[PDB]
Design a binder for this molecule. Structure first.
Ligand SMILES: O=c1cc(-c2ccc(F)cc2)oc2cc(O)cc(O)c12
Ligand SMILES: O=c1cc(-c2ccc(F)cc2)oc2cc(O)cc(O)c12
Lengths: 809, 809
């Protein structure tokens, strides 16, 4: 059909069809008379998996022969989404499979929809890991993703009576054809026990053993024939475990609970034992595997052969674990073991919000990991000795920098552990990296300025353009070729097309087609009727106070009130779509979801409004829904309070896909506006400096309420029960937070947000100028490719050279 | 190599090799450089599975088209063992695979050893189910095995310090290539709740739902291209289940515990709730599936299209369940629903031992299955009304026959439910069936004499001859052809060879080869050194008081004492091998294992004994060990107290494989001796009538102890600590039971057992006459083919005609 989807050759097609029918018969044990669409999906998945195998075997082979430095990306989260379409894209099989399936009388797009998302992450951090794996494969790095194969990923979200309800995400019920179990590489992980000191060193004894069984998933690079590995551990009980009889067998569950379920908190730390178990489990199994590989190539060369990247502090125990192995098992002296550890490990920080910081109570570590605690204290002592020598007399510095926090309960600051034990610490956007150096890690920065770097986040243009937006991919490719898909900076060439009538027509056409398709998807799957001619105003991301969905709610209510005041006046019609999950125990986040739906109930059913204003809560926001809605968006809402959103990646996805951004100077928004030019971005609100000025004098929300009549009216509607006539006090908690306890200064930005929203509507009245600005955005979106990010990691942290050379087929 | 293993054609072999290499690459994702023997096993398993698929699809297809009466064998146990070799045998692929693997440089026999047993049963009952599936497929019956896919089968048995230790049988760790998950046929099963009565009948409401997900395993018939289905249910939680968050997900375990583990009791009832859950779970899912199939062909024709065979009372709830569906859901009147139920259901009884009888407390049924209880009471009332009309005034009869037993706790007699709700009740050997009519079911028999039948047990000559003893299979086939493998009566033709010098030579040679192979297997796997020239005296079966392993121990100790008395006298050398599992909570059974090993410690280490007497406990007796040891045996020990062993099947396996039997007139032993002639069997001990005479006057063990000096010496050795020098009182419980509380009258049979054992040794001194008697045994073993058994079931219970006609390939 379209060119970027590749060739459908006669041979190729015939072959895919034969293999499809072979899998249906032999793999699925079905004839064409009893097969369901699910069987068909499975037959196709196996057929495509077949094309990976040789490449996967050869790539792993090639790494053994060449022995390059290996990158180990340790994450508790990999937010992969669906694998089928991504695999086809990367193997150039898409058109061939479309053709092959078509000829069997099947719609490939209908089959694609049957695949469960691998929702093994919460949000930005987990998706960053996924984009990274794609880029690392595309850049020919010998890189391995290591995590946990959770039986249950992020919960499926249902709305009932406007409230979020959580359901178990049983993504493995029907089987996963993409993974290969490797039981022969099963490893023991130890817990509990106690430490004996002997003649020749400390001994960790009387432990409980859980086994870690690995599952490997192929990670194909873009058309280079590279297939890297994602290795995820599953917990299994040993067979002597517990071993009246029945109960002992049933108690095997206790041990396997470790890999059972993803904790569904985004930027929130919950200090539960099961969570620490997961953190140690992935670290212990991963490090044994790393060391085993290494010895099949003296520890002096370890950092020349191994890089370990820590995705947040979740795998911070890799630092004490590597020490434990080097010192207790391999019998290296402390100082050498330490040198090796620091040169191997690097730490990526993802947020400055205090409630996200991992601070583990000591009593927990004491019981579960007694040896690791001793090692942590030893690290703390030696670290503080270095600090005291550098800053003699500065006792306050000593307590601020300690890995151990005194207080009610003593805790370990895992972020402090990470900085101490890493040769590099990076934030995830320039402004975030600056804030790390100015504020929370200032002391660490003054001690070791060389450790601190920036690596601005990115997204893969494979999933986030070619895959989800083939029509845009194609019109770009018509003008400038296909090379940009693995070299996104090439999009700058689109700037010479900003005054091309045909290209303007194409850009707008693709946007319109995307909106029609999405509007249809809404009606089919969720019986809702949206005007496709309206401006699509979308905020999709986890529900959070800092992300300020509430600010969007205030704008929505304002438009509503303006319409009612003057019903017979023109306004640019909008569909406001808001979507995301709240963490199950985050009450405020759950109230915001309810507020959103309650506004919809009023707005969507008002006859005077008509199709001028629609408010839709998009249920079950996940990767596969992002792929649908992001291409359909006109306006991206990126409206976190300045200094709170470390980077964001949603922002970049929308820039790439032809939406304009309304946002604060926060996270990568600053770099996006810099790349596109401020005149091509809808910037509003306090800067970082403004927020600090307001904090110095104190944030009084009442001042805003007293001075802005439009705002007062909204707060009164909320309070009086305009939005909740049966429970008039439903939203008392919300009004109250906004008036008395708003950490995120919603009111402070309200006035500038509304004015800036008026400028958006004004530009939308002028399609040509809208589209011209869109082009300026897409054309400058190159920096935000994860290819750029990973090449920066490779060169400035890992000490490896990326490559775009094909392995042989 | 050998003829019964089939042709290895050039095409066949080439083809298997291609498919083997295809699976290694594509299925297992391995090159020949990294593959382990386990990978090789898996590649072969997939390759053989491929040959089943078309046949499986066509057979299921054929049953839909022809719509024959369907047989549903409901068992909580299917003791399948390994599948690979059995599949090859039934598809005639064995030599071809041997050749194909050989050419790849692999030993097929080494690969076969890597397969886990599917140990989804305890002993006789579970193995009977497996043999039946084989026969039903071989006789072209449209038959389905229905059970539970336990995650853990019968525990792996280790001996430590002579004691049994249990380990979890994690048979699914590496995957099962033989099963196909069918998630699309998932069904709800309900538990708990309460009953509302309405205008239109009773309604079971507020239930908890567990899902039943089926896994299908192919059951190939012998060379007829028939492949039937074994469908096993796995328990899965619904996704709204429990749905703070984490705990709700972790609690999904509660529901899935149902299919987690096989209860390891043989002929023992344990009234645990989890066990009742399993019983209902398999019944509820099975019946929905049966009815669904039926409606895709009015309930008047149900029994013309459906037979349900109940393997013991374990699935007795099928009777109230079928009523519940017919009455509550389908709205049939009681009497019609009942007629349908009786005409559909048939009950096989497996034992008369009182501790095996399922008697479920009412409070348990009340809570878990309140509707089923009401239906059971309704059945009871109507049944007792029929009894009162037939036997007016006989109040005692009424209480004896009640389905409900009064007492401490009220209980339901599930066996009574089965007789009431079945058109046929069979025992499992002639003498057992007679005892059912004379004793425990006399009342039921007097009411409905037409219900009571015999169906003498059998074993499949595929697994139990061709597969485990190819060398015997071959020399038989040399004289009489291959037809006997599916028509075992043909073995009678061997009687014309009883005076053939060559055939005598062959029989003895094969026995000798089997003993060499087994003796080697002992050294390799368990570092033990046995004289292959000795008589192999084997007792393999579950450890039980009724099976009288202790009687064997007494004989062993007697030979020991005789040798010591007169060291310099000739005795026929013996290896006594005893093996089997004790139920984990059966203290006595566990003490017997320890006694066995303690005798070995004394006997095997006595220099004066030499290699004249060896005592070996065979660890982890299971199906795949039976396949090795049974062909190697000279003497089969079948020595249960008369009237206790309903049938036995071990007895038949050994008769088929060239061992002579020493046994009591118990179970099928009576029919075996009748088939072979008593002169060709070593019969000893009390008959049934003798046991009854002894019970009438009282069993005084002391009388035996006082009159038999040889016996007194043994009891004194036991007591004084001859066998346990460090714990002198170790065996106090055993001496005590033997002296004061022996239900099984070990002493009563001791004297006759020893004399009869002397006759065995005497015949063994004469190889030619030994072998001639062996031939008379093999030659008359035809009746004990499960083909005979199933043809009897088909004709006299199910109302279907067996067939030996090939389906097209
Ligand atoms: O997931 C959560 C996130 C947040 C949060 C608040 C404010 C920030 F700035 C950042 C995160 O708070 C919580 C409070 C709870 O009691 C339970 C929760 O699950 C959360
Ligand atoms: O598995 C068992 C079998 C028997 C048994 C005894 C005598 C017979 F005649 C038959 C069976 O007794 C038991 C007693 C227990 O306390 C626990 C057990 O697990 C068992």
């Amino acid at each position: 059909q379209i060119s970027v989807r590749g060739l459908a050759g006669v041979e190729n097609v015939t072959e895919l069809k034969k293999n499809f029918n072979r899998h249906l018969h032999f793999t699925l044990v079905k004839d064409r008379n009893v097969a369901t669409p699910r069987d068909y999906y499975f037959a196709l998945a196996h057929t495509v998996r077949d094309h990976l195998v040789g490449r996967w075997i050869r790539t792993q082979q090639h790494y053994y022969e060449k022995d390059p430095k290996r990158i180990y990306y340790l994450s508790l989260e990999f937010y992969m989404g669906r694998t089928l379409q991504n695999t086809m894209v990367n193997l150039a099989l898409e058109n061939a499979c479309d053709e092959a399936t078509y000829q069997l009388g099947l719609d490939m797009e209908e089959l694609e929809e049957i695949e469960e998302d691998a929702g093994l992450g919460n949000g930005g951090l987990g998706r960053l890991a996924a984009c990274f794996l794609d880029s690392m494969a595309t850049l020919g790095l010998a890189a391995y993703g290591y995590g946990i194969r959770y039986e249950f990923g992020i919960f499926n979200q249902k709305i009932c009576g406007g409230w979020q309800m959580e359901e178990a995400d049983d993504w493995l019920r029907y089987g996963n054809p993409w993974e290969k179990a490797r039981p022969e590489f099963t490893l023991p992980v130890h817990f509990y026990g106690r430490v004996e000191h002997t003649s020749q060193g400390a001994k960790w004894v009387d432990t409980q053993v859980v086994l870690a069984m690995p599952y490997d998933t192929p990670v194909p690079g873009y058309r280079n024939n590279v297939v890297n590995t994602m290795r995820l551990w599953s917990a299994k009980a040993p067979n002597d475990f517990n071993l009246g009889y029945i109960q002992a067998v049933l108690d095997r569950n206790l041990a396997e609970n470790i890999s059972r379920v993803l904790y569904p908190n985004d930027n929130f730390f919950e200090g539960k034992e099961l969570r620490l178990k997961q953190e140690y489990f992935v670290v212990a199994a991963t490090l044994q595997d790393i060391i085993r590989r290494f010895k099949s190539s003296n520890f002096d060369a370890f950092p020349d052969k191994v890089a370990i990247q820590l995705n947040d502090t979740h795998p911070s125990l890799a630092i004490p674990e590597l020490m434990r192995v080097l010192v207790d098992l391999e019998r290296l002296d402390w100082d050498k073991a330490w040198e090796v550890t620091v040169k191997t490990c690097a730490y990526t920080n993802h947020t400055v919000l205090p409630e996200a910081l991992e601070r583990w109570p000591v009593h927990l570590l004491e019981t579960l990991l007694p040896r690791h605690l001793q090692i942590i204290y030893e690290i703390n002592q030696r670290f503080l000795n270095r600090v005291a020598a550098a800053f003699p007399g500065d006792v306050d510095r000593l307590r601020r920098m300690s890995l151990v926090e005194e207080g009610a309960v003593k805790r370990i600051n895992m972020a402090h552990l990470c900085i101490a034990g890493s040769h590099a610490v990076n934030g995830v956007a320039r402004i975030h990296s600056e804030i790390l150096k100015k504020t929370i890690f200032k002391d660490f920065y003054e001690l070791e300025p060389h450790k601190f770097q920036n690596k601005t986040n990115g997204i893969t243009p494979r999933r986030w353009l070619v895959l989800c937006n083939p029509g845009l991919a194609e019109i770009i490719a018509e003008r400038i070729g296909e090379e940009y898909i693995s070299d996104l900076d090439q999009l700058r060439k689109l700037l010479s097309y900003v005054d091309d009538e045909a290209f303007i027509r194409d850009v707008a056409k693709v946007k319109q087609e995307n909106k029609l398709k999405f509007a249809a998807y809404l009606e089919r799957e969720y019986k809702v009727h949206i005007n496709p001619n309206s401006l699509f105003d979308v905020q999709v991301k986890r529900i959070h106070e800092y992300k300020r969905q509430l600010l969007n709610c205030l704008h929505v209510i304002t438009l509503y009130n303006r319409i009612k005041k003057e019903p017979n006046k023109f306004v640019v019609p909008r569909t406001v779509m808001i979507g995301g999950k709240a963490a199950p125990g985050y009450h405020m986040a759950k109230m915001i979801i309810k507020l959103i739906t309650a506004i919809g109930d009023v707005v969507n059913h008002d006859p005077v409004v008509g199709d001028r204003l629609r408010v839709i809560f998009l249920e079950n926001y996940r990767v596969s829904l992002a792929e649908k809605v992001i291409p359909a968006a006109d306006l991206s809402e990126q409206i976190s309070t300045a200094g709170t959103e470390a980077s964001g990646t949603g922002n970049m996805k929308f820039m790439l896909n032809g939406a304009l951004t309304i946002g604060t100077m926060d996270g990568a928004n600053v770099e996006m506006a810099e790349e596109a030019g401020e005149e091509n971005f809808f910037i509003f609100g306090m800067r970082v400096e403004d927020v600090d000025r307001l904090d110095q004098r104190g944030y009084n929300a009442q001042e805003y309420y007293d001075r802005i009549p439009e705002l007062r009216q909204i707060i009164e509607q909320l309070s009086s029960g305009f939005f909740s006539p049966k429970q008039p006090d439903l939203f008392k908690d919300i009004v109250n937070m906004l008036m008395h306890h708003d950490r995120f200064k919603v009111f402070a930005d309200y006035e500038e947000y509304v004015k800036c929203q008026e400028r958006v509507s004004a530009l939308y009245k002028n399609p040509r100028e809208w589209t011209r600005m869109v082009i300026r955005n897409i054309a400058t979106s190159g920096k935000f490719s994860s290819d750029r990010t990973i090449a920066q990691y490779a060169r400035e942290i890992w000490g490896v050279e990326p490559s775009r050379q094909r392995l042989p087929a």
